[PDB]
């Protein structure tokens, strides 16, 4: 069987441990993780960003996460990853269409997921509008990665985006 | 669902256009307050130079005025606004059009509310248009320390620049400290002072500066009546104000003596929030008229108090109080916090939390 | 504490 080609921060034994954890999550042994298999864990059932993470990991866009995508996904949360790639993963959470920019509609929808009934739609739309206006420097009505980091790059949240493998 | 276009399109989008000097001022140098009012309600902004011109020209008018204004009836007296611009709009509907109504504001135009710079820009513009019929007094929030401690300095940096903030600070120094209304009422923001026994004591003050930590100028802006005002026991006149951490508490015998010595009927002030928007204190045992009146013009204070606001319309020897409720205003997160700063710690938390559990 | 709360 031909070898698998990946790009991650993990050692051989770390890819192995992640491998045995991948097989355990693959209930039907289909070789890939599904949304249902992700939601099988009770701790993920009340998490409003599970679908966003899955969509990000799913780099081929088939709706499921294979072993390669699994490794390359988790790798962005390694201790051996820099501040940039962790802020970029955060950027990708808002950037739904993956075009490299954050638009008004995108920022709203992702916020709506996280807020729920804690705010009104009209209220949420207003603060989404004013946020982009103040952070948009080149003035193209959308937020780039540089404009994004210019706003949050001092909150040190990349510190609390680290998992143990 | 579209990822680019706005989802809730019914919600009005704040205009990017910034009003020019030509659009705000006419050929005669008069500010178009109607144009200004409508634009500000859309959360629209002006050019910096235009905003600076409204502030400075208004300041030049204010600094030509005395510490103690002489204002005759009829007049509408107003209390705290605290940056509640969209409630200020309702205030002018209820209190009457400044085109044919005399006005007296008792201060606290900024802080707490997230439309403080719009309140100043509009009021200053009205002052330019009606220099002899609209009047503004200084509140304890119209200074450098409180505006930096709260949100007004922050608001200027977000909506405009620190230059505009500096201009406002210099303009606030020019604000008169008190007003003598209809030869009967002393009108201040806070109240009385142990170092102010006559009206001329106010005239001798140097108001063109930062309010000191203590003294007559501090007390006018900061002092409160006692909690048991009218029902004193240990009496005294002035005691240390533990609520403010500065200035004094003044008593009923204290104000009554001041009224009798200066031949005044009552004292109009603000400084303290009221559920009814106003409060009538104990009548004087000489006139049978309330010796102290508190006016509060900020309805639903901090969007939480759910209080009514009020204005005092004194005309035809009748002191009528117009109560009014709050009005809708565009939403702001606490301290002008943007959604990225708000949501990112939640993103980093939940996303990390998910992965910890799928690897447990 | 499931959804993002207004501070
Ligand atoms: Ca499977
Ligand atoms: Ca896949
Ligand atoms: Ca995008
Ligand atoms: Ca941009
Ligand atoms: Fe106040
Ligand atoms: Zn005050």
Numbering used by the authors:
A (entry chain B): 5 to 169
B (entry chain A): 11 to 370
C (entry chain C): 384 to 390
Paper's wording?
Calcineurin (CN; Protein Phosphatase 2B or 3) is a ubiquitously expressed Ca2+/calmodulin activated PSP2. It is composed of a catalytic CNA subunit, which includes a calmodulin-binding and an auto-inhibitory domain, constitutively bound to a regulatory CNB subunit that binds 4 Ca2+ ions. Increases in the cytoplasmic levels of Ca2+ activate CN, which then catalyzes the dephosphorylation of a plethora of substrates critical for a diverse set of biological processes including development, learning and memory. Rather, recent studies have shown that the NFATs bind directly to CN using two distinct short linear motifs (SLiMs), the “PxIxIT” and the “LxVP” motifs.
Electron density was present for NFATc1LxVP SLiM residues 384DQYLAVP390. The absence of electron density for NFATc1LxVP residues 391–400 suggests that these residues remain flexible upon complex formation. The NFATc1LxVP SLiM, which buries ~950 Å2 of solvent accessible surface area, binds CN in an extended conformation to an expansive hydrophobic pocket located at the CNA/B interface. This is the same pocket occupied by LxVP-containing inhibitors. As expected, the NFATc1 residues that interact most extensively with CN are Leu387NFATc1 and Val389NFATc1. Leu387NFATc1 binds into a deep hydrophobic pocket formed by CN residues Trp352CNA, Phe356CNA and Val119CNB while Val389NFATc1 is anchored by a comparatively shallower hydrophobic pocket formed by Trp352CNA, Pro344CNA, Leu343CNA, Try341CNA and Leu123CNB. The canonical ‘P’ in the LxVP sequence, Pro390NFATc1, binds a third shallow hydrophobic pocket defined by residues Trp352CNA, Pro344CNA and Leu343CNA. While the backbone of Ala388NFATc1, the ‘x’ in the LxVP sequence, forms a hydrogen bond with the sidechain of Trp352CNA, its side chain makes no interactions with CN. Comparing the CN:NFATc1LxVP complex with CN:A238L shows that Tyr386NFATc1 overlaps perfectly with Phe288A238L. Second, Tyr386NFATc1 (ɸ residue) is part of a newly identified 3-residue hydrogen bond network between the ɸLxVP peptide and CNB.
